[PDB]
Design a protein around this ligand. Structure first.
Ligand SMILES: *[C@@H]1O[C@H](CO)[C@@H](O[C@@H]2O[C@H](CO)[C@@H](O)[C@H](O)[C@H]2NC(C)=O)[C@H](O)[C@H]1NC(C)=O
Ligand SMILES: *[C@@H]1O[C@H](CO)[C@@H](O[C@@H]2O[C@H](CO)[C@@H](O)[C@H](O)[C@H]2NC(C)=O)[C@H](O)[C@H]1NC(C)=O
Ligand SMILES: *[C@@H]1O[C@H](CO)[C@@H](O[C@@H]2O[C@H](CO)[C@@H](O)[C@H](O)[C@H]2NC(C)=O)[C@H](O)[C@H]1NC(C)=O
Ligand SMILES: *[C@@H]1O[C@H](CO)[C@@H](O[C@@H]2O[C@H](CO)[C@@H](O)[C@H](O)[C@H]2NC(C)=O)[C@H](O)[C@H]1NC(C)=O
Ligand SMILES: *[C@@H]1O[C@H](CO)[C@@H](O)[C@H](O)[C@H]1NC(C)=O
Ligand SMILES: *[C@@H]1O[C@H](CO)[C@@H](O)[C@H](O)[C@H]1NC(C)=O
Ligand SMILES: *[C@H]1O[C@H](CO)[C@@H](O)[C@H](O)[C@H]1NC(C)=O
Ligand SMILES: *[C@H]1O[C@H](CO)[C@@H](O)[C@H](O)[C@H]1NC(C)=O
Length: 629
């Protein structure tokens, strides 16, 4: 209720609190039942820089309010009943920088209610019933940067209505959700400078959009947003007026856009950020994207027709500066031999769920990416079942390859990865089955992260381990594979390994003292291991020496096993341990000879759902149970 900011929100107040500190600089009276704001009630609060009375039932402002509050900068009156403004309403609010007047059923503005707002930066008149952008009769609001007029009833734009902004530089003119049917010649030129224009949810269509762009010719426009404006088609004339601009962001998302005519964007050589997501493009032509040679970011998520879309070879060849291409969630048949040809700056490519399928990654699938400096390639959710030898040989700069969430069922011969000289991470989690050999990862000794979660993983017990070549590995996820057989040298030579996930496997036997040959010390030498997940493996015994090398271990997860008895000294080398998790085991006792050194430095303990019996109290730090104790 007070940190020099007063929160009086949601309190069913019919009057301003008369007993807050004279300290306060922010008064928040949102969601109450105020009908009026009398000037006398604010004498006490001469220090307010912000007054938020949004969501009340205020129908008028006493002009003297603003002389009581000479420091008022932010005034929020949204969702009230302030439908009539006069020249008196804000005349004394000369210090305002933000004025929020949304949802007041303002239908008309009649004279100059904003003329004293010489320091105003933001004016928000959204969600009213305004049929015009006329907000005064003389040049004013010179400092205004954002004018928000969205969700009104504006039907035309006219120079004589916007010319009070002749001295203003508008970063944002938001006219979304108005039924604008006319851009009268010169309308945008009436504004001193116009940088950003939003006409989202304005039914325009190709013919009116072309007139609009003509009105934008020779303006300062950088950002133009036409989302859901029914731009069903574009042609080489639609954006012609933008030839006389330095437009850098165009948003044509959500347009049910079906046909992109050749040279539709020839007139946008400076465009850098292009949003085409959620459209219905049936066939992308080889010259549809001609001229876009400065585009750095292109979003094509769900841009193409569903169910099939056609992308001509060489369609992206023009996009010489494109660095980040999102093509996710589409029904493209497959990848043609020149699909990405010309993309000489592409560093990021998302093809997640982009194809009806890409059943087989052949040695030609990615050829058109050979001259791209590609670092990230996302191939998730493409129902991929088979990766052939040399599938990624074209991708010598690739750092991250995401192949998760496919249907890959194969032996990894190791040839799949040839050419991947710079690989840092391979994500293979959630595939149908992967059978490893000693050679599965030999061609990628630079690998640092390898995720093989839930891939029905076979033959990790290869004779030199499949992981032997990966001396720089820092993360290995082997979880959820029902692995029963691991050799003691599985992770030998992996001194850099920091994260090891082995949960939901079947390793219980390996750590029983009765295991034939004796227990398997597969954590030996892992001196930089920080996080170790051994949950849900059926463990009911831990050999005393299994964590003996784990001096840097910070987090151990041994929960959801069947442990009770732990041998004395088992956690003795655990000098760095911060979280010890043993929830949902069969633990009846907690003796110092085991837990003393483990508890020494913990910031977190979770032994929550165990069958306790012969116990020992808690002191210094986080134990999240009082019920599960
Ligand atoms: C697009 O950008 C160019 C280059 O930035 C603008 O050219 C400017 O015009 C002035 C005077 O005519 C010249 O001195 C310079 O070449 C540019 N000045 C600046 C701001 O750096 C051009 O005006 C821009 N187009 C539009 C419609 O504003
Ligand atoms: C002009 O468009 C650009 C690009 O979409 C906007 O800048 C981005 O803003 C978002 C968040 O609003 C960030 O995530 C990006 O990093 C920004 N881009 C860069 C590279 O600066 C920009 O806000 C738009 N201008 C206006 C005033 O609407
Ligand atoms: C590959 O693309 C998918 C999007 O299809 C990414 O998955 C999303 O990422 C976050 C964090 O992993 C999840 O919480 C989201 O729910 C995922 N979204 C979807 C739609 O599945 C994935 O992260 C990308 N891979 C890489 C390396 O960036
Ligand atoms: C494993 O990691 C080390 C990085 O610590 C790599 O060795 C370095 O390589 C870089 C770039 O080639 C050089 O700047 C250094 O001379 C190397 N550092 C040391 C300490 O030797 C090594 O290349 C990685 N292995 C692979 C196959 O990538
Ligand atoms: C656009 O379309 C047609 C080609 O069908 C052509 O006649 C016309 O000159 C092209 N370019 C422009 C800028 O009008
Ligand atoms: C791709 O693999 C097949 C082997 O089945 C071979 O015919 C072809 O020569 C290979 N292509 C390249 C680019 O090496
Ligand atoms: C606005 O300017 C005037 C100085 O003339 C003053 O009343 C007030 O302190 C300023 N706004 C602030 C700092 O809230
Ligand atoms: C542009 O697309 C048209 C389809 O409208 C196609 O016939 C033509 O080959 C393309 N232009 C050029 C010069 O390749």
């Amino acid at each position: 209720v007070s940190h020099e900011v007063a929160d009086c929100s949601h309190l069913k107040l019919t009057q301003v609190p008369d007993d807050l500190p004279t300290n306060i600089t922010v008064l928040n009276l949102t969601h109450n039942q105020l009908r009026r704001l009398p000037a006398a009630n604010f004498t006490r609060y001469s220090q307010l820089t912000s007054l938020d009375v949004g969501f009340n039932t205020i129908s008028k402002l006493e002009p003297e309010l603003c002389q009581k509050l000479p420091m008022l900068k932010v005034l929020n009156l949204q969702h009230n009943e302030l439908s009539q403004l006069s020249d008196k309403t804000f005349a004394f609010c000369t210090n305002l920088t933000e004025l929020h007047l949304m949802s007041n059923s303002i239908q008309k503005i009649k004279n100059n209610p904003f003329v004293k707002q010489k320091n105003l930066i933001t004016l928000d008149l959204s969600h009213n019933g305004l049929s015009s952008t006329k907000l005064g009769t003389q040049v004013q609001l010179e400092n205004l940067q954002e004018l928000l007029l969205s969700n009104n009833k504006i039907q035309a734009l006219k120079s004589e209505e916007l010319d009070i902004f002749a001295n203003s530089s508008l970063k944002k003119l938001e006219l979304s959700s108005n039924q604008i049917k006319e851009f009268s010649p010169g309308c945008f030129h009436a504004i001193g400078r116009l940088f950003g224009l939003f006409l989202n949810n304005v039914q325009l269509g190709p013919s009116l959009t072309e007139k609009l762009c003509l009105e934008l010719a020779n303006t300062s426009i950088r950002n133009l947003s036409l989302s859901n404006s029914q731009l069903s088609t574009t042609s080489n004339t639609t954006f012609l007026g933008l030839k006389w601009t330095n437009l850098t962001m165009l948003d044509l998302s959500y347009n049910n856009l079906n046909v992109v005519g050749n040279d539709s964007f020839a007139w946008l050589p400076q465009l850098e950020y292009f949003f085409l997501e959620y459209n219905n493009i049936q066939h992308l032509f080889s010259h549809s994207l001609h001229g876009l040679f400065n585009v750095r970011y292109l979003n094509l998520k769900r841009s193409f027709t569903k169910q099939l879309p056609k992308i001509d070879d060489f369609s992206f060849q023009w996009l010489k500066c494109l660095e980040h291409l999102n093509m996710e969630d589409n029904d493209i048949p497959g990848i043609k031999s020149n699909m990405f040809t010309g993309l000489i700056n592409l560093k990021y490519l998302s093809l997640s769920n982009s194809f009806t399928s890409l059943r087989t990654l052949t040695n030609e699938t990615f050829v058109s990416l050979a001259h791209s400096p590609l670092h990230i390639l996302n191939l998730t959710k493409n129902k991929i079942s088979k990766i052939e030898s040399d599938a990624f040989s074209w991708l010598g700069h690739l750092e991250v390859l995401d192949l998760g969430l496919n249907e890959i069922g194969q032996e990894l011969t190791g040839q799949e990865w040839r050419g991947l000289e710079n690989i840092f991470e391979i994500y293979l989690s959630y595939n149908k089955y992967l059978q490893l050999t000693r050679n599965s990862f030999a061609l990628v000794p630079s690998l640092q992260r390898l995720m093989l979660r839930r891939v029905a993983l076979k033959n990790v017990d290869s004779s030199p381990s499949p992981f032997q070549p990966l001396r720089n590995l820092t993360i290995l996820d082997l979880s959820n594979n029902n692995i029963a057989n691991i050799n003691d040298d599985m992770l030998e030579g992996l001194e850099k390994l920091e994260i090891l996930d082995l949960q939901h496997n079947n390793l219980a036997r390996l750590w029983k003292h009765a295991n034939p040959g004796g227990p398997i010390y597969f954590l030996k030498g892992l001196s930089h291991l920080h996080i170790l997940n051994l949950e849900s493996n059926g463990f009911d015994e831990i050999p005393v020496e299994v964590f003996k090398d784990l001096f840097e271990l910070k987090i151990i997860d041994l929960g959801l096993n069947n442990l009770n008895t732990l041998p004395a000294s088992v956690f003795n080398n655990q000098v760095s341990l911060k979280s010890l998790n043993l929830q949902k085991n069969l633990i009846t006792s907690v003796e110092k000879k085991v837990f003393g050194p483990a508890f020494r430095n913990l910031t977190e303990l979770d032994m929550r759902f165990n069958p306790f019996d012969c116990t020992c109290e808690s002191i210094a730090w986080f134990v999240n149970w009082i019920n599960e104790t």
